[PDB]
Amino acid sequence: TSAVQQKLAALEKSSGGRLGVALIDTADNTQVLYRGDERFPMCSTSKVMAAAAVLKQSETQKQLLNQPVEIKPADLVNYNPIAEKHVNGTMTLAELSAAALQYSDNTAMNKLIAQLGGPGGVTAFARAIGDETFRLDRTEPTLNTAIPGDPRDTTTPRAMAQTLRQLTLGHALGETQRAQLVTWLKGNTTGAASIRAGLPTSWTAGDKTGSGDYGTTNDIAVIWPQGRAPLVLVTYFTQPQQNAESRRDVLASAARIIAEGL
Template structure:
Protein backbone atom coordinates (compact mmCIF):
# COMPACT_ATOMS: atom_id res chain seq x y z
CA UNK A 1 0.00 0.00 0.00
CA UNK A 2 1.24 3.48 -0.74
CA UNK A 3 1.48 5.62 2.43
CA UNK A 4 -0.59 8.78 2.75
CA UNK A 5 1.41 11.55 1.09
CA UNK A 6 2.51 14.56 3.04
CA UNK A 7 1.81 16.74 0.06
CA UNK A 8 0.36 16.48 -3.42
CA UNK A 9 1.10 18.40 -6.58
CA UNK A 10 -0.33 18.85 -10.04
CA UNK A 11 0.66 21.34 -12.65
CA UNK A 12 -1.01 24.74 -12.86
CA UNK A 13 -1.37 24.12 -16.60
CA UNK A 14 -3.39 20.99 -15.88
CA UNK A 15 -5.71 22.68 -13.42
CA UNK A 16 -6.32 25.63 -15.70
CA UNK A 17 -7.30 23.25 -18.47
CA UNK A 18 -9.94 21.50 -16.40
CA UNK A 19 -13.61 22.25 -16.85
CA UNK A 20 -16.49 20.51 -15.10
CA UNK A 21 -18.44 21.58 -12.08
CA UNK A 22 -15.82 24.02 -10.83
CA UNK A 23 -14.13 26.87 -12.66
CA UNK A 24 -10.41 26.62 -13.25
CA UNK A 25 -9.73 29.43 -10.80
CA UNK A 26 -11.90 27.92 -8.12
CA UNK A 27 -10.32 24.52 -8.63
CA UNK A 28 -6.83 25.98 -8.31
CA UNK A 29 -7.76 27.91 -5.19
CA UNK A 30 -9.42 24.90 -3.60
CA UNK A 31 -6.48 22.67 -4.40
CA UNK A 32 -3.91 25.13 -3.13
CA UNK A 33 -5.72 25.45 0.18
CA UNK A 34 -6.48 21.75 0.56
CA UNK A 35 -4.79 19.56 3.16
CA UNK A 36 -2.79 16.53 2.11
CA UNK A 37 -4.90 13.90 0.34
CA UNK A 38 -4.97 10.25 1.26
CA UNK A 39 -4.27 7.89 -1.63
CA UNK A 40 -6.96 5.22 -2.07
CA UNK A 41 -5.97 1.78 -0.85
CA UNK A 42 -6.52 0.48 -4.39
CA UNK A 43 -3.38 2.26 -5.59
CA UNK A 44 -0.49 -0.14 -6.05
CA UNK A 45 3.20 0.75 -6.14
CA UNK A 46 4.03 -2.02 -8.60
CA UNK A 47 4.33 -0.45 -12.04
CA UNK A 48 7.39 -1.27 -14.10
CA UNK A 49 7.31 2.23 -15.58
CA UNK A 50 8.15 3.62 -12.13
CA UNK A 51 6.72 6.63 -10.30
CA UNK A 52 3.64 4.86 -8.96
CA UNK A 53 3.49 6.84 -5.73
CA UNK A 54 3.73 10.11 -7.65
CA UNK A 55 1.03 9.05 -10.08
CA UNK A 56 -1.31 8.06 -7.25
CA UNK A 57 -0.77 11.41 -5.51
CA UNK A 58 -1.46 13.35 -8.70
CA UNK A 59 -4.59 11.34 -9.50
CA UNK A 60 -5.86 12.02 -5.98
CA UNK A 61 -5.22 15.74 -6.53
CA UNK A 62 -7.02 15.60 -9.87
CA UNK A 63 -10.04 14.00 -8.21
CA UNK A 64 -10.07 16.68 -5.54
CA UNK A 65 -9.81 19.50 -8.09
CA UNK A 66 -12.59 18.20 -10.37
CA UNK A 67 -14.98 16.31 -8.04
CA UNK A 68 -14.60 13.30 -10.35
CA UNK A 69 -13.80 9.81 -9.09
CA UNK A 70 -11.18 8.13 -11.28
CA UNK A 71 -10.22 4.50 -11.75
CA UNK A 72 -7.02 3.55 -13.59
CA UNK A 73 -5.12 0.45 -14.62
CA UNK A 74 -1.86 0.61 -16.60
CA UNK A 75 0.02 -2.57 -17.40
CA UNK A 76 2.84 -3.32 -19.81
CA UNK A 77 2.25 -6.50 -21.80
CA UNK A 78 3.95 -9.53 -20.30
CA UNK A 79 4.42 -7.87 -16.91
CA UNK A 80 2.30 -9.16 -14.04
CA UNK A 81 2.81 -5.88 -12.24
CA UNK A 82 0.45 -2.99 -12.89
CA UNK A 83 -0.32 0.50 -11.72
CA UNK A 84 -3.77 0.29 -10.14
CA UNK A 85 -5.81 3.16 -8.78
CA UNK A 86 -9.34 2.33 -7.55
CA UNK A 87 -8.92 -0.62 -9.87
CA UNK A 88 -11.42 -2.86 -8.09
CA UNK A 89 -14.09 -0.16 -7.74
CA UNK A 90 -17.31 -0.33 -9.76
CA UNK A 91 -17.84 2.18 -12.60
CA UNK A 92 -20.48 2.57 -15.32
CA UNK A 93 -19.31 0.71 -18.44
CA UNK A 94 -21.20 2.74 -21.07
CA UNK A 95 -19.98 2.18 -24.65
CA UNK A 96 -16.94 0.15 -23.64
CA UNK A 97 -19.26 -2.85 -24.09
CA UNK A 98 -19.09 -2.40 -27.87
CA UNK A 99 -15.58 -3.85 -28.01
CA UNK A 100 -16.88 -6.98 -26.29
CA UNK A 101 -19.90 -7.18 -28.59
CA UNK A 102 -17.78 -7.05 -31.74
CA UNK A 103 -15.25 -9.53 -30.34
CA UNK A 104 -17.99 -12.00 -29.40
CA UNK A 105 -19.61 -11.73 -32.83
CA UNK A 106 -16.35 -12.21 -34.73
CA UNK A 107 -15.46 -15.14 -32.48
CA UNK A 108 -18.81 -16.79 -33.23
CA UNK A 109 -19.25 -15.93 -36.92
CA UNK A 110 -15.94 -14.57 -38.15
CA UNK A 111 -15.31 -17.17 -40.86
CA UNK A 112 -18.86 -17.18 -42.21
CA UNK A 113 -18.32 -15.02 -45.29
CA UNK A 114 -21.99 -15.14 -46.26
CA UNK A 115 -23.00 -13.78 -42.87
CA UNK A 116 -20.54 -10.87 -43.00
CA UNK A 117 -21.57 -9.87 -46.51
CA UNK A 118 -25.35 -10.02 -45.91
CA UNK A 119 -26.97 -6.68 -44.90
CA UNK A 120 -29.03 -6.61 -41.71
CA UNK A 121 -32.19 -4.49 -42.06
CA UNK A 122 -33.41 -2.05 -39.41
CA UNK A 123 -36.22 0.50 -39.09
CA UNK A 124 -36.82 3.96 -37.68
CA UNK A 125 -37.94 2.28 -34.47
CA UNK A 126 -34.42 0.86 -34.04
CA UNK A 127 -32.64 4.23 -34.34
CA UNK A 128 -31.65 5.75 -30.99
CA UNK A 129 -29.74 8.84 -29.90
CA UNK A 130 -26.04 9.34 -30.67
CA UNK A 131 -26.09 7.33 -33.90
CA UNK A 132 -23.98 9.50 -36.18
CA UNK A 133 -23.52 6.79 -38.81
CA UNK A 134 -26.81 4.91 -38.93
CA UNK A 135 -29.10 7.88 -38.30
CA UNK A 136 -29.11 8.94 -41.96
CA UNK A 137 -28.29 5.61 -43.59
CA UNK A 138 -30.44 4.95 -46.64
CA UNK A 139 -31.48 2.23 -47.28
CA UNK A 140 -31.74 1.16 -43.66
CA UNK A 141 -29.53 -1.87 -43.76
CA UNK A 142 -25.91 -2.63 -42.91
CA UNK A 143 -23.61 -5.62 -42.97
CA UNK A 144 -22.21 -6.88 -39.65
CA UNK A 145 -18.83 -5.44 -40.62
CA UNK A 146 -20.35 -2.03 -41.25
CA UNK A 147 -22.10 -2.19 -37.86
CA UNK A 148 -18.85 -3.13 -36.13
CA UNK A 149 -17.02 -0.24 -37.78
CA UNK A 150 -19.77 2.21 -36.81
CA UNK A 151 -19.88 0.94 -33.22
CA UNK A 152 -16.13 0.91 -32.60
CA UNK A 153 -14.87 3.87 -34.61
CA UNK A 154 -17.82 6.25 -34.13
CA UNK A 155 -19.52 4.74 -31.03
CA UNK A 156 -22.81 4.61 -32.93
CA UNK A 157 -25.50 3.53 -30.46
CA UNK A 158 -27.90 2.06 -32.99
CA UNK A 159 -25.09 -0.06 -34.36
CA UNK A 160 -24.32 -1.19 -30.81
CA UNK A 161 -27.92 -2.26 -30.29
CA UNK A 162 -28.06 -4.14 -33.59
CA UNK A 163 -24.89 -6.00 -32.61
CA UNK A 164 -26.48 -6.86 -29.26
CA UNK A 165 -29.54 -8.13 -31.12
CA UNK A 166 -27.33 -10.39 -33.23
CA UNK A 167 -25.80 -11.80 -30.04
CA UNK A 168 -29.15 -12.37 -28.31
CA UNK A 169 -29.23 -9.35 -25.99
CA UNK A 170 -27.18 -7.65 -23.26
CA UNK A 171 -26.77 -10.83 -21.24
CA UNK A 172 -24.46 -12.15 -23.95
CA UNK A 173 -21.91 -9.49 -22.99
CA UNK A 174 -21.98 -10.57 -19.35
CA UNK A 175 -21.44 -14.18 -20.38
CA UNK A 176 -18.65 -13.32 -22.82
CA UNK A 177 -16.82 -11.24 -20.22
CA UNK A 178 -17.11 -14.05 -17.67
CA UNK A 179 -15.69 -16.52 -20.20
CA UNK A 180 -12.53 -14.39 -20.23
CA UNK A 181 -12.30 -14.23 -16.44
CA UNK A 182 -14.00 -10.84 -15.93
CA UNK A 183 -16.74 -11.74 -13.47
CA UNK A 184 -17.52 -8.20 -12.29
CA UNK A 185 -18.61 -6.96 -15.71
CA UNK A 186 -22.31 -7.01 -16.54
CA UNK A 187 -24.57 -5.55 -19.20
CA UNK A 188 -28.27 -5.40 -18.45
CA UNK A 189 -29.83 -2.82 -20.77
CA UNK A 190 -29.70 -1.51 -24.32
CA UNK A 191 -28.58 1.85 -25.68
CA UNK A 192 -29.16 4.52 -24.52
CA UNK A 193 -30.54 3.32 -21.15
CA UNK A 194 -27.31 1.54 -20.26
CA UNK A 195 -25.66 4.98 -19.91
CA UNK A 196 -27.85 6.12 -16.99
CA UNK A 197 -24.87 5.73 -14.62
CA UNK A 198 -26.93 6.24 -11.45
CA UNK A 199 -24.61 5.96 -8.44
CA UNK A 200 -25.04 2.66 -6.65
CA UNK A 201 -26.92 0.98 -9.50
CA UNK A 202 -25.07 -2.27 -10.27
CA UNK A 203 -26.50 -2.57 -13.76
CA UNK A 204 -24.23 -2.04 -16.77
CA UNK A 205 -21.07 -1.74 -14.69
CA UNK A 206 -17.51 -2.99 -14.65
CA UNK A 207 -14.21 -2.34 -12.90
CA UNK A 208 -10.91 -0.99 -14.25
CA UNK A 209 -9.35 -4.39 -13.45
CA UNK A 210 -11.96 -6.20 -15.55
CA UNK A 211 -11.69 -3.87 -18.55
CA UNK A 212 -7.89 -4.12 -18.46
CA UNK A 213 -8.13 -7.91 -18.36
CA UNK A 214 -10.63 -7.97 -21.24
CA UNK A 215 -8.97 -5.44 -23.54
CA UNK A 216 -5.50 -6.92 -23.02
CA UNK A 217 -6.85 -10.40 -23.70
CA UNK A 218 -8.70 -9.36 -26.85
CA UNK A 219 -6.27 -6.85 -28.39
CA UNK A 220 -2.93 -8.40 -27.44
CA UNK A 221 -3.49 -12.07 -26.60
CA UNK A 222 -6.14 -12.85 -29.26
CA UNK A 223 -8.31 -14.49 -26.60
CA UNK A 224 -11.34 -14.47 -28.94
CA UNK A 225 -9.24 -15.84 -31.81
CA UNK A 226 -6.60 -14.42 -34.12
CA UNK A 227 -9.20 -13.08 -36.55
CA UNK A 228 -11.12 -11.27 -33.79
CA UNK A 229 -7.91 -9.72 -32.48
CA UNK A 230 -6.83 -8.59 -35.93
CA UNK A 231 -10.19 -7.04 -36.76
CA UNK A 232 -10.49 -5.31 -33.40
CA UNK A 233 -7.05 -3.77 -33.83
CA UNK A 234 -7.85 -2.63 -37.36
CA UNK A 235 -11.06 -0.88 -36.31
CA UNK A 236 -9.90 0.49 -32.96
CA UNK A 237 -6.57 1.84 -34.19
CA UNK A 238 -8.67 4.17 -36.35
CA UNK A 239 -11.05 5.24 -33.59
CA UNK A 240 -12.41 8.77 -34.12
CA UNK A 241 -13.85 9.52 -30.67
CA UNK A 242 -10.86 9.89 -28.32
CA UNK A 243 -9.27 13.05 -29.66
CA UNK A 244 -10.19 15.00 -26.52
CA UNK A 245 -9.51 12.12 -24.12
CA UNK A 246 -6.55 9.72 -24.19
CA UNK A 247 -5.16 11.04 -27.47
CA UNK A 248 -5.11 14.57 -26.04
CA UNK A 249 -2.83 13.34 -23.25
CA UNK A 250 -0.33 11.51 -25.46
CA UNK A 251 2.77 12.77 -27.22
CA UNK A 252 3.37 11.41 -30.75
CA UNK A 253 4.57 9.17 -32.21
CA UNK A 254 2.29 6.43 -30.92
CA UNK A 255 -0.46 4.09 -32.05
CA UNK A 256 -3.57 3.65 -29.90
CA UNK A 257 -6.38 1.13 -30.27
CA UNK A 258 -9.07 2.36 -27.90
CA UNK A 259 -12.77 2.69 -27.19
CA UNK A 260 -14.49 5.58 -25.43
CA UNK A 261 -17.73 5.74 -23.49
CA UNK A 262 -19.84 8.39 -21.82
CA UNK A 263 -22.99 8.64 -19.78
CA UNK A 264 -25.08 10.65 -17.38
CA UNK A 265 -23.57 11.96 -14.13
CA UNK A 266 -20.65 13.26 -16.20
CA UNK A 267 -19.19 9.83 -16.92
CA UNK A 268 -16.30 9.75 -19.41
CA UNK A 269 -14.31 6.57 -20.08
CA UNK A 270 -11.49 5.52 -22.36
CA UNK A 271 -9.69 2.18 -22.56
CA UNK A 272 -7.31 0.53 -24.98
CA UNK A 273 -3.79 -0.50 -25.85
CA UNK A 274 -0.95 1.92 -26.58
CA UNK A 275 2.04 1.10 -28.78
CA UNK A 276 5.21 3.23 -28.73
CA UNK A 277 8.57 2.55 -30.37
CA UNK A 278 11.02 0.67 -28.17
CA UNK A 279 8.44 -0.08 -25.46
CA UNK A 280 6.15 -2.94 -24.70
CA UNK A 281 2.45 -2.43 -25.47
CA UNK A 282 0.66 -0.72 -22.60
CA UNK A 283 -2.91 -1.57 -21.68
CA UNK A 284 -4.45 1.62 -20.29
CA UNK A 285 -7.89 1.97 -18.71
CA UNK A 286 -9.34 5.21 -17.34
CA UNK A 287 -12.89 5.13 -15.98
CA UNK A 288 -14.71 7.95 -14.18
CA UNK A 289 -17.89 8.63 -12.26
CA UNK A 290 -19.52 11.33 -10.13
CA UNK A 291 -22.43 11.61 -7.71
CA UNK A 292 -23.75 14.78 -9.38
CA UNK A 293 -26.74 14.30 -11.72
CA UNK A 294 -25.96 17.70 -13.27
CA UNK A 295 -22.29 17.02 -13.91
CA UNK A 296 -21.09 17.63 -17.46
CA UNK A 297 -18.68 15.31 -19.24
CA UNK A 298 -15.16 16.55 -18.60
CA UNK A 299 -12.92 15.01 -21.25
CA UNK A 300 -9.89 16.79 -19.84
CA UNK A 301 -10.03 14.59 -16.75
CA UNK A 302 -9.23 11.56 -18.93
CA UNK A 303 -6.62 13.53 -20.89
CA UNK A 304 -4.89 14.69 -17.71
CA UNK A 305 -5.03 11.21 -16.15
CA UNK A 306 -3.35 9.93 -19.32
CA UNK A 307 -0.59 12.54 -18.98
CA UNK A 308 -0.08 11.58 -15.33
CA UNK A 309 0.19 7.86 -15.96
CA UNK A 310 1.90 7.73 -19.36
CA UNK A 311 4.04 10.86 -19.15
CA UNK A 312 6.26 11.34 -22.19
Protein backbone atom coordinates in the same frame (compact mmCIF):
# COMPACT_ATOMS: atom_id res chain seq x y z
CA THR B 1 0.39 3.65 -2.26
CA SER B 2 2.66 4.72 -5.14
CA ALA B 3 3.72 8.17 -6.39
CA VAL B 4 1.59 7.63 -9.51
CA GLN B 5 -1.38 6.71 -7.28
CA GLN B 6 -0.84 9.91 -5.27
CA LYS B 7 -0.73 12.03 -8.44
CA LEU B 8 -3.96 10.34 -9.59
CA ALA B 9 -5.50 11.05 -6.16
CA ALA B 10 -4.62 14.75 -6.49
CA LEU B 11 -6.13 14.85 -9.99
CA GLU B 12 -9.28 13.21 -8.65
CA LYS B 13 -9.52 15.65 -5.74
CA SER B 14 -9.32 18.66 -8.10
CA SER B 15 -11.83 17.08 -10.53
CA GLY B 16 -14.74 16.91 -8.08
CA GLY B 17 -15.58 13.38 -9.28
CA ARG B 18 -14.51 9.76 -8.91
CA LEU B 19 -11.65 8.44 -11.06
CA GLY B 20 -10.75 4.83 -11.87
CA VAL B 21 -7.55 3.82 -13.65
CA ALA B 22 -5.97 0.55 -14.66
CA LEU B 23 -2.73 0.22 -16.60
CA ILE B 24 -1.16 -3.01 -17.79
CA ASP B 25 2.37 -2.57 -19.11
CA THR B 26 3.04 -5.65 -21.25
CA ALA B 27 6.82 -4.99 -21.01
CA ASP B 28 6.72 -6.65 -17.57
CA ASN B 29 2.98 -7.38 -17.04
CA THR B 30 2.92 -4.99 -14.07
CA GLN B 31 -0.14 -2.95 -13.22
CA VAL B 32 -0.98 0.47 -11.89
CA LEU B 33 -4.43 0.65 -10.32
CA TYR B 34 -6.42 3.54 -8.91
CA ARG B 35 -9.84 2.48 -7.57
CA GLY B 36 -9.09 -0.57 -9.69
CA ASP B 37 -11.72 -2.76 -8.00
CA GLU B 38 -14.50 -0.18 -7.78
CA ARG B 39 -17.42 -0.35 -10.21
CA PHE B 40 -18.01 2.34 -12.81
CA PRO B 41 -20.68 2.68 -15.50
CA MET B 42 -19.11 1.54 -18.79
CA CYS B 43 -21.30 3.53 -21.16
CA SER B 44 -20.05 3.11 -24.74
CA THR B 45 -16.82 1.38 -23.68
CA SER B 46 -19.06 -1.71 -23.52
CA LYS B 47 -19.21 -1.62 -27.36
CA VAL B 48 -15.78 -3.29 -27.40
CA MET B 49 -17.16 -6.38 -25.64
CA ALA B 50 -20.14 -6.57 -28.02
CA ALA B 51 -18.03 -6.16 -31.18
CA ALA B 52 -15.54 -8.74 -29.88
CA ALA B 53 -18.37 -11.18 -29.17
CA VAL B 54 -19.56 -10.89 -32.78
CA LEU B 55 -15.96 -11.35 -33.98
CA LYS B 56 -15.83 -14.54 -31.91
CA GLN B 57 -19.05 -15.75 -33.57
CA SER B 58 -17.45 -15.04 -36.96
CA GLU B 59 -14.69 -17.57 -36.21
CA THR B 60 -17.17 -20.37 -36.91
CA GLN B 61 -19.13 -18.42 -39.56
CA LYS B 62 -16.72 -17.05 -42.20
CA GLN B 63 -19.43 -14.90 -43.81
CA LEU B 64 -21.03 -13.56 -40.61
CA LEU B 65 -19.58 -10.05 -40.92
CA ASN B 66 -21.29 -9.78 -44.32
CA GLN B 67 -24.72 -10.65 -42.89
CA PRO B 68 -27.28 -7.87 -43.44
CA VAL B 69 -29.34 -6.41 -40.61
CA GLU B 70 -32.44 -4.28 -41.27
CA ILE B 71 -32.42 -0.73 -39.89
CA LYS B 72 -35.94 0.62 -39.35
CA PRO B 73 -37.00 4.17 -38.37
CA ALA B 74 -38.25 2.77 -35.04
CA ASP B 75 -34.74 1.43 -34.31
CA LEU B 76 -33.08 4.84 -34.11
CA VAL B 77 -32.08 5.88 -30.61
CA ASN B 78 -30.27 8.98 -29.31
CA TYR B 79 -26.98 8.97 -31.26
CA ASN B 80 -26.98 7.38 -34.69
CA PRO B 81 -24.51 9.17 -36.98
CA ILE B 82 -24.11 6.12 -39.24
CA ALA B 83 -27.37 4.20 -38.80
CA GLU B 84 -29.53 7.21 -39.74
CA LYS B 85 -28.00 7.01 -43.25
CA HIS B 86 -29.29 3.44 -43.66
CA VAL B 87 -32.84 3.56 -42.28
CA ASN B 88 -35.26 1.49 -44.38
CA GLY B 89 -32.20 -0.40 -45.66
CA THR B 90 -29.60 -2.73 -44.18
CA MET B 91 -26.11 -2.66 -42.68
CA THR B 92 -23.82 -5.66 -42.44
CA LEU B 93 -22.48 -6.85 -39.09
CA ALA B 94 -19.06 -5.49 -40.13
CA GLU B 95 -20.61 -2.11 -40.90
CA LEU B 96 -22.43 -2.15 -37.54
CA SER B 97 -19.26 -3.11 -35.68
CA ALA B 98 -17.28 -0.31 -37.34
CA ALA B 99 -20.06 2.20 -36.70
CA ALA B 100 -20.34 1.22 -33.04
CA LEU B 101 -16.59 1.26 -32.41
CA GLN B 102 -15.38 4.14 -34.57
CA TYR B 103 -18.35 6.53 -34.35
CA SER B 104 -19.96 5.31 -31.10
CA ASP B 105 -23.27 4.71 -32.94
CA ASN B 106 -25.86 3.59 -30.38
CA THR B 107 -28.26 2.05 -32.90
CA ALA B 108 -25.36 -0.03 -34.22
CA MET B 109 -24.64 -1.23 -30.69
CA ASN B 110 -28.26 -2.32 -30.27
CA LYS B 111 -27.94 -4.47 -33.39
CA LEU B 112 -24.78 -6.09 -32.02
CA ILE B 113 -26.55 -6.77 -28.72
CA ALA B 114 -29.50 -8.35 -30.57
CA GLN B 115 -27.10 -10.54 -32.60
CA LEU B 116 -25.79 -11.84 -29.25
CA GLY B 117 -29.28 -12.57 -27.85
CA GLY B 118 -29.59 -9.47 -25.66
CA PRO B 119 -27.44 -7.78 -23.00
CA GLY B 120 -26.95 -11.10 -21.18
CA GLY B 121 -25.38 -12.58 -24.33
CA VAL B 122 -22.68 -9.92 -24.14
CA THR B 123 -22.13 -10.76 -20.45
CA ALA B 124 -21.94 -14.47 -21.39
CA PHE B 125 -19.12 -13.73 -23.82
CA ALA B 126 -17.28 -11.77 -21.12
CA ARG B 127 -17.49 -14.80 -18.82
CA ALA B 128 -16.30 -17.11 -21.62
CA ILE B 129 -13.10 -15.06 -21.95
CA GLY B 130 -12.48 -15.00 -18.18
CA ASP B 131 -14.05 -11.67 -17.22
CA GLU B 132 -16.16 -12.35 -14.12
CA THR B 133 -16.81 -8.64 -13.43
CA PHE B 134 -18.32 -7.12 -16.60
CA ARG B 135 -22.11 -6.99 -16.72
CA LEU B 136 -24.32 -5.64 -19.47
CA ASP B 137 -27.94 -5.37 -18.32
CA ARG B 138 -29.62 -2.95 -20.73
CA THR B 139 -29.63 -1.78 -24.33
CA GLU B 140 -28.94 1.72 -25.67
CA PRO B 141 -29.67 4.37 -24.52
CA THR B 142 -30.64 3.35 -20.98
CA LEU B 143 -27.33 1.58 -20.32
CA ASN B 144 -25.91 5.15 -19.95
CA THR B 145 -28.00 6.24 -16.95
CA ALA B 146 -24.82 5.88 -14.86
CA ILE B 147 -26.59 6.23 -11.50
CA PRO B 148 -24.17 6.18 -8.55
CA GLY B 149 -24.27 2.82 -6.77
CA ASP B 150 -26.22 1.12 -9.58
CA PRO B 151 -24.45 -2.12 -10.55
CA ARG B 152 -26.16 -2.31 -13.96
CA ASP B 153 -23.89 -1.93 -16.99
CA THR B 154 -20.72 -1.62 -14.92
CA THR B 155 -17.28 -3.10 -14.64
CA THR B 156 -14.06 -2.36 -12.74
CA PRO B 157 -10.94 -0.75 -14.25
CA ARG B 158 -8.87 -3.88 -13.38
CA ALA B 159 -11.29 -6.23 -15.15
CA MET B 160 -11.68 -4.07 -18.25
CA ALA B 161 -7.92 -3.64 -18.67
CA GLN B 162 -7.37 -7.40 -18.42
CA THR B 163 -10.15 -8.03 -20.94
CA LEU B 164 -8.93 -5.42 -23.41
CA ARG B 165 -5.43 -6.93 -23.19
CA GLN B 166 -6.71 -10.46 -23.88
CA LEU B 167 -8.84 -9.25 -26.81
CA THR B 168 -6.28 -7.03 -28.55
CA LEU B 169 -2.89 -8.47 -27.58
CA GLY B 170 -3.72 -11.98 -26.32
CA HIS B 171 -5.55 -15.05 -27.57
CA ALA B 172 -9.20 -14.46 -26.65
CA LEU B 173 -9.90 -14.08 -30.39
CA GLY B 174 -8.47 -15.82 -33.46
CA GLU B 175 -5.59 -13.96 -35.13
CA THR B 176 -7.68 -12.55 -38.00
CA GLN B 177 -10.35 -11.37 -35.55
CA ARG B 178 -7.82 -9.83 -33.14
CA ALA B 179 -6.26 -7.92 -36.04
CA GLN B 180 -9.71 -6.70 -37.15
CA LEU B 181 -10.52 -5.46 -33.65
CA VAL B 182 -7.20 -3.61 -33.46
CA THR B 183 -7.78 -2.11 -36.93
CA TRP B 184 -11.19 -0.85 -35.82
CA LEU B 185 -9.89 0.65 -32.56
CA LYS B 186 -6.97 2.36 -34.31
CA GLY B 187 -9.47 3.97 -36.69
CA ASN B 188 -11.59 5.44 -33.90
CA THR B 189 -12.84 8.99 -34.62
CA THR B 190 -13.87 9.99 -31.10
CA GLY B 191 -10.68 9.72 -29.07
CA ALA B 192 -8.33 12.68 -29.64
CA ALA B 193 -9.43 14.59 -26.50
CA SER B 194 -9.32 11.66 -24.07
CA ILE B 195 -6.49 9.20 -23.16
CA ARG B 196 -4.61 9.95 -26.36
CA ALA B 197 -4.46 13.70 -25.59
CA GLY B 198 -2.22 12.85 -22.62
CA LEU B 199 0.25 10.69 -24.56
CA PRO B 200 3.41 11.69 -26.43
CA THR B 201 2.39 12.39 -30.03
CA SER B 202 4.94 9.88 -31.40
CA TRP B 203 3.03 7.02 -29.76
CA THR B 204 0.20 5.21 -31.57
CA ALA B 205 -3.03 3.91 -30.07
CA GLY B 206 -6.52 2.59 -30.56
CA ASP B 207 -9.31 3.47 -28.15
CA LYS B 208 -13.01 3.40 -27.36
CA THR B 209 -14.63 6.32 -25.54
CA GLY B 210 -17.83 6.45 -23.54
CA SER B 211 -20.02 9.05 -21.89
CA GLY B 212 -23.31 9.13 -20.02
CA ASP B 213 -25.33 10.84 -17.33
CA TYR B 214 -23.59 11.98 -14.11
CA GLY B 215 -20.95 13.54 -16.36
CA THR B 216 -19.60 10.06 -16.91
CA THR B 217 -16.55 10.24 -19.19
CA ASN B 218 -14.64 7.08 -20.09
CA ASP B 219 -11.93 5.77 -22.39
CA ILE B 220 -10.19 2.43 -22.88
CA ALA B 221 -7.04 2.20 -25.00
CA VAL B 222 -4.37 -0.07 -26.37
CA ILE B 223 -1.17 1.93 -26.79
CA TRP B 224 2.09 1.34 -28.68
CA PRO B 225 4.69 3.66 -27.14
CA GLN B 226 7.84 4.53 -29.09
CA GLY B 227 10.46 1.85 -28.34
CA ARG B 228 8.30 0.06 -25.75
CA ALA B 229 6.04 -3.01 -25.54
CA PRO B 230 2.31 -2.12 -25.73
CA LEU B 231 0.23 -0.81 -22.84
CA VAL B 232 -3.43 -1.22 -22.02
CA LEU B 233 -5.03 1.72 -20.20
CA VAL B 234 -8.53 2.20 -18.80
CA THR B 235 -9.70 5.56 -17.45
CA TYR B 236 -13.20 5.84 -16.00
CA PHE B 237 -14.66 9.02 -14.50
CA THR B 238 -18.03 9.88 -13.00
CA GLN B 239 -19.49 12.83 -11.10
CA PRO B 240 -22.08 13.35 -8.33
CA GLN B 241 -24.74 15.35 -10.24
CA GLN B 242 -26.92 13.89 -13.00
CA ASN B 243 -26.41 16.80 -15.40
CA ALA B 244 -22.65 17.18 -14.90
CA GLU B 245 -20.53 18.18 -17.91
CA SER B 246 -18.17 15.75 -19.69
CA ARG B 247 -14.54 15.92 -18.57
CA ARG B 248 -12.39 14.32 -21.28
CA ASP B 249 -9.54 16.53 -20.05
CA VAL B 250 -9.48 14.52 -16.79
CA LEU B 251 -8.87 11.34 -18.78
CA ALA B 252 -6.08 13.08 -20.72
CA SER B 253 -4.55 14.19 -17.40
CA ALA B 254 -4.71 10.64 -16.01
CA ALA B 255 -3.01 9.30 -19.14
CA ARG B 256 -0.27 11.91 -18.92
CA ILE B 257 0.42 10.98 -15.27
CA ILE B 258 0.64 7.30 -16.32
CA ALA B 259 2.94 8.07 -19.27
CA GLU B 260 5.26 10.27 -17.19
CA GLY B 261 5.46 7.47 -14.59
CA LEU B 262 6.82 4.85 -17.00
